[PDB]
Each structure stands twice: as structure tokens, then as C-alpha cells.
Write a protein that binds this ligand. Sequence first.
Ligand SMILES: Cc1c(C(=O)C2=C(O)CCCC2=O)ccc2c1c(=O)n(Cc1ccc3ccccc3c1)c(=O)n2C
Ligand SMILES: Cc1c(C(=O)C2=C(O)CCCC2=O)ccc2c1c(=O)n(Cc1ccc3ccccc3c1)c(=O)n2C
Ligand SMILES: [Co+2]
Ligand SMILES: [Co+2]
Lengths: 379, 379
Amino acid sequence: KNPKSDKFKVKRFHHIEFWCGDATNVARRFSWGLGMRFSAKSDLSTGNMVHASYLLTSGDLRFLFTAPYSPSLSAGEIKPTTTASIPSFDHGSCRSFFSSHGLGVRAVAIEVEDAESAFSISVANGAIPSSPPIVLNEAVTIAEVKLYGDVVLRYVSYKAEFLPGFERVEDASSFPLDYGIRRLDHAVGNVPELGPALTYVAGFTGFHQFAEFESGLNWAVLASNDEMVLLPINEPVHGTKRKSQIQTYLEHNEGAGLQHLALMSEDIFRTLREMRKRSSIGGFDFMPSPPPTYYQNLKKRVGDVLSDDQIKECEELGILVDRDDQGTLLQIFTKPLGDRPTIFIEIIQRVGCMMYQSGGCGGFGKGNFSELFKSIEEY
Amino acid sequence: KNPKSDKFKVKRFHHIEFWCGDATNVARRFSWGLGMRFSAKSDLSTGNMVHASYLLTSGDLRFLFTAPYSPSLSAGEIKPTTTASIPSFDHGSCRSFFSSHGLGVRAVAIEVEDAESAFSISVANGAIPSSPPIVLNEAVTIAEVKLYGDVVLRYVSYKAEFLPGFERVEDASSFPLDYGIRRLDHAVGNVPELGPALTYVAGFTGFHQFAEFESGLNWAVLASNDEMVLLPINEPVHGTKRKSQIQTYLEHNEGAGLQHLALMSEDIFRTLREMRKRSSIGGFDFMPSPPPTYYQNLKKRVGDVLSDDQIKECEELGILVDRDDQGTLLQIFTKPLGDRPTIFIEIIQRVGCMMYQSGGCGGFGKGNFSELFKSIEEY
Ligand SMILES: Cc1c(C(=O)C2=C(O)CCCC2=O)ccc2c1c(=O)n(Cc1ccc3ccccc3c1)c(=O)n2C
Ligand SMILES: Cc1c(C(=O)C2=C(O)CCCC2=O)ccc2c1c(=O)n(Cc1ccc3ccccc3c1)c(=O)n2C
Ligand SMILES: [Co+2]
Ligand SMILES: [Co+2]
């Protein structure tokens, strides 16, 4: 059941912004690890004396990496005279965020019809304002409200190239890497209490609970009208045999924040071949692969969707498979992206639900918790 | 003239420690960019609840990358019960360093006969203490004094594997990258006033001025007895046509600090081929190459040392060449390693001065300032 209750017009995920200590090194590591190209910059060379921001793209996926310069470079500026290209940026907020949480997502940005209206409707419906709407070069409007922890939901709307003041990156410095990743499928938060977090976000967005279908967590998924913006939220389950990975996150992160980004691939097998080739030479590592048990049990579950060859290809790459009543999900998880056992990445590809493909086809892997436990015990 | 006045027994450069916001991403970027392998770690997986430290090696070159965890993880510890593997580490100092200076070198570490004695003699001769000698597992002694800015000179001495509490990195996570880099040749500081900086450091080390042979700077080089530890120091020259790059450094760095690390290659042509292949796919960029003028003028200067083929190889890779009365220096400079126009890397190879090769053979490139200016003007 989809009541289609969005309180303003939402289009798609627009970008994810990481707050960094050094944007250059994180951006270069991510570019090589995920096969994303450098497409835009805003930094000293573009006249920005406040922050360094570098944009990576793969398909429609946009990752922005931002770090503060010395405040002394901009000490004479005021907000009317700022050289920052993202006017919500604040030196103190960024340093406090990074010192508190380490490397992680500051902003989940969605494109909307009218960012000013989205901001106003959100705050009228309980959203905690973070940065008021500001029009950039009479062309783009950006506004921010609190999502959870120190993560903001950023609204971006375009009258009619990333943001004003960003310059497209020179061809020589823009190598056309591509491992097949094409868009952000969902962005997941960890919170101490699910109930209040859901009530808050659903309260100011009108996002509805996305219909789905004892190991660590409870969760629910909030979704826009066409279910293309998907925001799952997790809470820990305490008192269990193995300590909840949600609680570990909250401890190492100093509270709520973004847990994982799930990146849709147009060919998950090529993406994982390319990413695993680079794991030990600057890229990303992946979670330990499931026992061959798990793949011996895949035939009975998805043998009508994947061939024996396509299944054996899952086993060599460590890919997980789950299934809805509507579609099939192929998924795999990286190890944490930085020093702390906090944020990680999921690579996914969805099979089925053709009409274009409807959002969330095949779910989020709920059935893979039970399947993995059974495999582990029976090994 | 070498008075051999070291006040304690100095061996070689031991390691360089970067203070980071996220050690993982900087270490992975540097590993791929410079061809250094992951060889040791001290982090949560080794019981260290205080800091994450990752060691990269290439030959005898050791780069250590360190970042703080949340202080909450170790809030119950005191120094007698610390889980830190580097007992000089302090959360507040590290966060203050990184917020002030951005990514950069905290420690220039040299191996000595007796770190306790080196510390005592240094402080008795004017060194400002930073961290007193501490014996690690009855096996290694480490001590630190101030060098310039917030950079420390770290003394390490071994009774008889990097440091106690570090674990060697698993073979699967340790890819044997190697682009030919073999050791640290020199480490260079930028200061506002050369005179007082030289008097201070030479005062507590007994290092002597290394004999050498109007564009931005003045400098001098301090050297150990066998001139294998080489510490040049730069100051700005004000009032010039083009603004001094030393002054730009001091402004963007918030004061004195380490300007460049010069890394000796056993085959600079292979190193630069490998590094330039990776510039746009996560590695390091290089300064703009000199005009072909410069290479047209190389024949008259070093045609007795390099063949026409070896010279043309310099031109395609952008390598600079200078010459002493004793030897020849091949050198090239990266663009800044991170967001700020502060620290960068030099790759070098030295030809001549055979006896082993004596330290500093061919100088530091003093003659390349005049040669580059002449080339530029005449283009
Ligand atoms: C992150 C994720 C999802 C996922 O995407 C997701 C959504 O999008 C929204 C709903 C909530 C949710 O979870 C699905 C399945 C997953 C994992 C995962 O992270 N893991 C790794 C793991 C799980 C427990 C652990 C407990 C202790 C120690 C390590 C552990 C590692 C899995 O095994 N499955 C099977
Ligand atoms: C860093 C270095 C060295 C070097 O190693 C070194 C030592 O070890 C100790 C003695 C002091 C010293 O310098 C040698 C030559 C160099 C450079 C360099 O950095 N550069 C790049 C540049 C120079 C001016 C600029 C002025 C304005 C704007 C950009 C500029 C870029 C060079 O051209 N030469 C020719
Ligand atoms: Co997911
Ligand atoms: Co040098």
C-alpha cells in the first residue's frame, strides 16, 4: 500500500556529501576504488577561500567530498561576501562533525521541484531547520533540515553545472573510470530509537513506510511517492548473544549517523570484478564471503532467476542473493570506508518489477540474515 | 668542511609520521600513488583503542599514517594503562594539529644509538621537550623534541618489528607494490626566520651546515656526521615581484612546518613512469614540466653524464637535472599532497660521489632555480 503522501514534489537522489579532513585524499581513494571520475571542483583555484570540494560521478551517482581550509583565509569575509560555493558550510560545524564522527556523510541531497517550498513545508511539519533556502546565481536553490544525528537532508532545486561556482574538471585530470555503478539506490541511518526517528522524518516529509516481504536490529524504510528515494533507518536490539552492530556503530560514531550507501550497478559482476582487483592497491575491501553452503542453497531459492554459471559467478565474487514476491536482489557489502567501524558501502543490482523498474524491487536483503545464519551454523 | 660535531650518535632516517583525519584513506591513496606496501598496523584490531596507525614501506622508506579515534573508546584509560602503541600520541594534540595545519608531517624520526641519551643531551642543549623517553616492551625507546612549528624530531633506538604493539599486515592485504623508491634523502622545513631556526636545531643536535655549491627564499642545510640525515630549512624573502612560495606555505599552513620530503629512487625513470601512469587514477600529480628550452640546454650542462637517450627520457617525464662539483642530481616535484598548497614530495636520484655514495651528492637543486627562470624568460 502506497498512500503517496509526500508533502512536496520529490524527484531523485541528487548527491551525497562527505565531510572530510582532507578532501583530496578521500576523493582520490574513492575515485580509484569505485570507478568514479572527477567531474567538478570548488577550491582555491576557483576562488573558494573557505572549503575545498571535489565532485566524483559515475552515471547519475554524485559523491561530493568537502574539507575546510584555515579560517584565516576567509577571516575578512561575512556571509554576504562569502567565497564559499556551498553557503551552508561552516568551518566550526565541519571540524566538530569530523572530530566527533570521523569521515562520514554530512548531507543526503535530494532534488525537489522547489527547495524553498520543501524547506518551508518541512519546517511547518516539524523539521528542525539547519540552513535556510539560499538562491545561488539565480539558478539553484539549496536548503537543509536535520535528518538524524549530524546528518542533514539537503533539498536542491533547479530553475532550468553541479552548483554555481563549481568548475568542470580539466580533461587531463579527469580519467574516464567506470566500473558500472549508476545511481544511489538507498541511504541508511543508524539511530538509538527507531520509533521517534521514523515519526520525525515521516512527519515532515510525508514519506510512507515501504512494504517489506532476531539478529541485531530492527528497521523500517521510508519512501517517496514513486519509491525512488528510499531511506531505511535501523535501531539496535539489546541483550542479544552477539553484540548488535548497530550499537557498535553508535558507540564508534558518537551517536546516530549514516550507516551505508547502496549503489546500483548496471552489471554487479563487472563492478565487483573491478573493485576486488583494486582492494589491496588502494580500493575497498569486502566483507568475508559466505560459506559455499550459502551458494549450495542458492539453487533452490533463485535457480529460476540465475543460471548455474551466473550462480557460480556469485560464489567467486562473494555476492549475496535475496528475493521478494516481486523481484530478486543481488548485494554485497564493503568493509568500513575509513578508520572507524561505522559507514560502509553496499553494491546492488535488482532483477524484476518491470513496468522502467519500480523502486526497491526485491527488498533490502531481509531474508539474507536468516540465510547467512543458517549457512554459518551448518558449516 | 665537516666538523663532525653531532652531540649523540645518529644513524639514519627511520620513519615519517603523518597526522591525519582518516589514516585509512590517506594511507591507501599514498600506497597506490607512490608504490608502497602496507607492512604494519596498530588499530582497533590490534587492541589499540586510542589511535589508528598504518605503516607503508618502500625499501627503507617508512611512512606512518595516524588518526585519533573517539576519545570515548579510551576514556577509562590513564597513561599507565594506555592501549596506544605510540605513547606520545594525544587526542587533543592530534586534532589541534590537523585542524590548524591540515594533512602533514607531525614527526621526522631518526634512529639513534640511545634515544634516552639523545633526548637528555638535546634538552641540555636547548631542545624544547615534547615527549619524554619511554621504553616500549623493554625493546624500543622513543622520545620527541620540538623541531619547528608543530613538527617534532623523534628519536628511536633499538636494543636489538616496526614498534611493539604493531602487527605485520596479512599477506592478502599486503600487495607488493614497488615503483623503485628506496629511502628518505632529506626532509625540509619552512620557517618565518631562518637564523633562529638554524641556531636552535644546530644548537641541540650538533648538526653542521652542509656545504652547497633571487627567487623566493633563503635556506641552509643541517647534516649529521656522515651527512646521511639532511634537514634543509627555508625562510621567505619578502618584497619580491612574485610572492614567495615559502610565505604562501606559512599562510596556508598556519605557520612553520614540513615543506617537502625528498624520496630517493634507485631508478627515477621507472619511478616517474609508474607514478605518472597513476596521476589521474588516484595517485599524485606533478608540477608543470619545464619548457623544451630547459632540455635543449641540458646537453651543455650534463652531456658528459647523461646520454642523448637518457636526456630525452628526462624531457618526456619532466625531470630536472642539476650538478655539483662532485655529482649530479635528477629531481622532480609533485603538486601538493593534500587540499592545502603546503606539503609536497620530491623524487630524486643522485649520480656520483662514490667511495657507497656520500650523502647529498650533487646538492639540492640550487642551480635549477636560475636555469628554470632563464628557460621561462627565453621561451
Ligand atoms: C547492511 C545489510 C543489509 C542492508 O542493506 C539493510 C538495508 O538496506 C535496510 C534494512 C536493514 C539492513 O540491514 C542487508 C543484509 C545484510 C547487511 C549486512 O550488513 N550484513 C553484514 C553483517 C550483519 C550483521 C552482523 C552482526 C555482527 C557482526 C557483523 C555483522 C555483519 C549482512 O550480513 N546482511 C545480510
Ligand atoms: C623544492 C625545490 C627544491 C628543493 O628541493 C630544496 C631543497 O631540498 C633545499 C634547498 C631549498 C629547496 O628549494 C629545489 C629546486 C626547486 C624546488 C621547487 O619547488 N621548485 C618549484 C617552484 C619554485 C618556486 C616557485 C615560485 C612561485 C611559484 C611556484 C614555484 C615553484 C623549483 O622550481 N625548483 C627548482
Ligand atoms: Co542496504
Ligand atoms: Co629537495
